[PDB]
């Protein structure tokens with residue numbers, strides 16, 4: 001009924017305020033930022049995903065632009081308010097729109113140190129192995145044969 | 148000396164054993180190194196930082 | 198699913214006027230009682246405006 | 253009590269003030285979660301009315317960094333204590349050894 | 353055409369270490385059943401755990417009593433590892449009284465009929481003064497999984513008695529599972545393997561009663577294979593017990609009867625002033 | 633509440649193909665997603681009833697490394713094309729068909745003899761191409777009923793019979809919340825079939841095969 | 851499941867021979883300098899090389 005009623009409801013944390021917060025969270029971008037902001041890729045926009053805990057989860061492909069490992073780093077979250085701010089967060093600094101560094105056209109989302117090891121283990125070629133020298137109908141048959 | 152101490156007990160002298168996945172029961176190749184490390188808890192808690 | 202805005206930028210504009218026209222459209226949708234021209238799957242004014250931008 | 257150490261845990265544990273080292277040897281007369289009473293041998297006792305030794309272990313308190321500081325006895329009744337033995341384990345101490 | 357498995361044998365190495373067999377199994381079903389049974393025996397198995405123990409002379413776990421070498425926190429810590437088996441009910445309150453120099457094992461606990469102590473030599477505390485005694489009430493319950501005391505901060509049911517001490521509850525009795533598939537006998541038919549499950553627990557559950565429960569849970573989850581008092585007495589005199597029957601009629605209609613009193617009318621007015629009931 | 637486990641509600645059964653679906657079970661208990669998914673995937677892959685081609689002999693060829701004039705393909709390629717053939721054998725356990733045809737043009741599955749109970753599900757499936765006016769092809773395809781994938785080395789030309797009618801299956805567990813708890817699972821199953829049976833039916837078949845193995849205990 | 855062990859870092863078998871040859875060469879290339887043939891700077895530049 002009044003603002004004080006909603007304030008008390010959020011203070012008591014009813015089971016409905018979570019389903020209400022999910023509505024506003026669905027399509028409202030937020031800005032993440034690490035302490036030393038050298039270039040402009042130190043501030044990007046993401047779509048929040050409500051998770052249980054007290055730590056932020058960061059996609060392991062945007063760590064190169066932030067220059068952020070996981071040994072204690074912290075980042076700040078900013079919430080755009082107006083319509084123009086949200087449209088700029090979506091159309092100018094969304095994480096999926098900044099994949100090429102402005103210093104050189106080369107990409108900045110290249111995986112490393114965990115993804116390249118697995119792909120290097122898949123695309124390896126051994127000499128003697130089980131199932132060597134046969135003919136398959138396609139890649140799905142190879143997946144079935146491996147699993 | 149570490150190898151002799153591993154051989155006193157009934158333990159593999161190589162240091163690596165074969166593990167199985169817990170979610171599928173499948174066995175990892177390239178037997179992994181399993182042992183006991185002394186870990187510490189530093190006074191940087193996420194409760195004092197969020 | 199507004200994952201990217203590539204096609205909207207490719208269609209027309211200099212990536213700056215698009216923000217302004219989408220803001221005007223979303224403001225007319227939210228404050229004004231103008232009905233949307235596209236069906237909404239529990240979406241906000243900004244996403245609906247960006248999706249209506251394409252034609 | 254780390255399984256793999258260097259042998260420098262005894263020195264660090266004892267030289268600090270976190271533990272409760274026995275001043276004079278003897279026998280544990282009364283052990284408790286907060287007090288330890290040691291009956292001193294007749295030879296180590298001073299001539300005129302020497303008496304006994306009593307150790308009041310510090311219980312749950314705060315540090316400069318807001319951490320707990322409490323001691324715990326590691327002896328039992330009748331145990332013969334010698335001069336220099338550890339009678340209580342402070343924070344990060346296991347039977348008189350550094351354990352972080 | 354599939355040879356269904358049977359419960360052939362159930363070995364017993366000790367009170368806790370068991371070894372079961374599930375002959376006969378076809379090709380490719382050994383591991384398929386073994387892993388799916390291990391993941392259920394580890395995750396969800398009912399059990400009993402100590403919680404909410406109250407001691408007479410304490411107010412919080414950070415204190416210490418006299419004539420006792422252990423600490424209250426250590427006592428609450430080693431009470432957590434008490435293996436109890438309860439068959440009658442799901443909520444028991446034990447009692448532990450002892451005095452004199454000597455340890456305090458699990459045998460010293462009360463001897464209620466529907467409560468079995470699996471390990472009587474489980475040392476709980478140590479007394480070090482003949483002029484000392486301990487008296488506590490151990491509240492056992494029943495559940496599954498791991499529920500820490502920190503989650504019991506709802507504060508919407510009742511208030512905490514200052515001398516009540518919460519305990520973490522490890523309900524799961526199972527400790528570890530180690531299955532292994534291997535070739536069975538000839539059986540006049542090849543491609544027949546056996547499943548040898550090797551469980552271990554705290555001696556509070558039976559191997560067969562655990563396997564038959566894990567399989568039951570698995571089947572129940574797999575079943576989803578389809579497509580898709582005077583104030584109250586004044587109202588009760590008119591056979592009205594629920595508040596809805598009184599709220600269906602207006603306060604003027606309720607005041608038109610001699611069964612209602614002055615105190616009942618005042619209570620009804622005080623309840624209606626909050627706009628919750630009796631609004632016509 | 634000791635044996636009160638949650639039950640999924642598979643409202644999302646959306647599919648974008650006739651022989652390809654994507655089922656979504658939600659919500660499950662923590663740890664049941666991987667269990668159920670892996671069990672059903674292992675069963676659907678390694679133990680599934682079906683009929684496929686086992687061995688095919690050629691009229692005048694008795695070796696793998698040979699060739700016949702007028703055919704745009706090779707023996708290996710036509711054997712690989714015969715591996716992809718899907719046949720729903722009814723009644724009898726096995727039966728041997730033939731491919732007697734002499735005509736210019738691609739040889740489709742409709743050119744095979746009907747042979748009564750044998751019902752081809754993909755008449756558009758092309759086996760080989762013919763270009764000469766006198767080049768005739770003749771072979772004796774032999775179907776057989778089994779369970780699983782049997783290679784050639786495990787076993788006239790041999791054919792790796794794919795009895796299981798599933799082309800691929802890959803589950804994916806996710807996170808689900810019911811009003812308080814974000815630790816619940818959300819199973820998502822993706823499977824493509826070869827057209828003999830719908831995947832929604834294959835899920836039921838695998839679940840039934842798994843449930844019938846737990847009768848002596850429940 | 852690619853771990854890292856103590857045996858996963860193999861030492862070459864002929865490293866000891868190389869070290870012995872190098873130290874035997876140095877045990878006389880310094881005495882050659884001590885005879886006044888070469889200067890200290892060039893001797894240092896040869897030793898580092």
Ligand SMILES: [Mg+2]
Pocket residue numbers: 067068069070071072073
């Ligand atoms: Mg860092």
